[PDB]
UniProtKB/Swiss-Prot annotation:
One of its GO terms (biological process) is proteolysis. Belongs to the peptidase M24A family. Methionine aminopeptidase type 1 subfamily. Substrate binds at H111, H209. Keywords: Aminopeptidase, Hydrolase, Metal-binding, Protease. It comes from Mycobacterium tuberculosis (strain CDC 1551 / Oshkosh). The gene is map. This is Methionine aminopeptidase 2.
Length: 281
């Protein structure tokens, strides 16, 4: 279709007061980045709840992807799902972000802001929802087709889901963390795609981004070894075109400079005693 441009935002959606806010709501920055990478058994139990709720919200919003829907409506459905299940939407009020999920159409790499933009036939849309409940976070995203998606765009989406799943399969105690981005990038590059560098996955727990970084490209200089009880996301963004990007005037929305489309998937993972468990169903 035509290159995207910003629509109009709807007003802030309320959250029932009884649902606890993360500490960072309304503040310039979050108190995150230096927390332990291995979680306690108590926190891991809590993170199974938050992950399940985030995965339900993402699935409910995904069911509404269809030509003619607005990205604001996806956000209303995600928001409603989270608050009906007792969870706060972690994006809402993180460094002022104004909505309860990120909706990233077509050439939007990440961090799209739900708004009056109407989806049309052929579009792809990433919906990224995080839930905060029991003092911990759960983060997941997926890219959904709207209507009759072109073969090159269908392939990019299915190969980005494959890359994410291949990477998840490598996770176990003792594995070098660098294998994740080796597996993602070696697979994506077979088809000539380019793996985004400047946005990464991350440890997650009682804080949204806890200071652990997970790269999605090949970077053998990272020495980090995976430990039982570590919790982190794998969330590669994969481009049909070049990596060069621009940020919109809202200071959030990241778009490819060449306007070629891009796809993402994300799960929150637990390193178990023997392998990996997807906490976001
Ligand atoms: C692609 O998006 C991921 C992403 O930017 N990661 C990079 C980390 C972003 C925050 C700062 N970082 C840290 O290491 C700091 C320790 C805190 C890098 C992000 O985690 C998404 O999955 C999440 O759903 C959206 C979060 C908002 C920022 C829109 C609310
Ligand atoms: Mn996310
Ligand atoms: Mn994330």
């Amino acid at each position: 279709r035509t290159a995207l441009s910003p629509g109009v935002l709807s007003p802030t959606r309320p959250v029932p007061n009884w649902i606890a806010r993360p500490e960072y709501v309304g503040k310039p920055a979050a108190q995150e980045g230096s927390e332990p990478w291995v979680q306690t058994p108590e926190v891991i139990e809590k993170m199974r709840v938050a992950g399940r709720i985030a995965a339900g919200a993402l699935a409910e919003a995904g069911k509404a992807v269809a030509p003619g829907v607005t990205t604001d409506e996806l956000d209303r459905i995600a928001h409603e799902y989270l608050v009906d299940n007792g969870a706060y939407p972690s994006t809402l009020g993180y460094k002022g972000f104004p909505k309860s999920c990120c909706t990233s159409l077509n050439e939007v790499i990440c961090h799209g802001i739900p708004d009056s933009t109407v989806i049309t036939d052929g579009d792809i849309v990433n919906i990224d929802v995080t839930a905060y409940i029991g003092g911990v976070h759960g983060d997941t995203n997926a890219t959904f087709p709207a209507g009759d998606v072109a073969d090159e765009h269908r392939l990019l989406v299915d190969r980005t889901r494959e890359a994410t799943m291949r990477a998840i399969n490598t996770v176990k105690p003792g594995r070098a963390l660098s294998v994740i981005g080796r597996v993602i990038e070696s697979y994506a590059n077979r088809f000539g795609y380019n793996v985004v560098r400047d946005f990464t996955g991350h440890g997650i727990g009682t804080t949204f981004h806890n200071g652990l970084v997970v790269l999605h490209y090949d970077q053998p200089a990272v020495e980090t070894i995976m430990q039982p009880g570590m919790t982190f996301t794998i969330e590669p963004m994969i481009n049909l075109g070049a990596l060069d990007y621009e940020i919109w005037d809202d200071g959030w929305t990241v778009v490819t400079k060449d306007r070629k489309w891009t796809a993402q998937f994300e799960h929150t993972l637990l390193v178990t005693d023997t392998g990996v468990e997807i906490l976001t169903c």
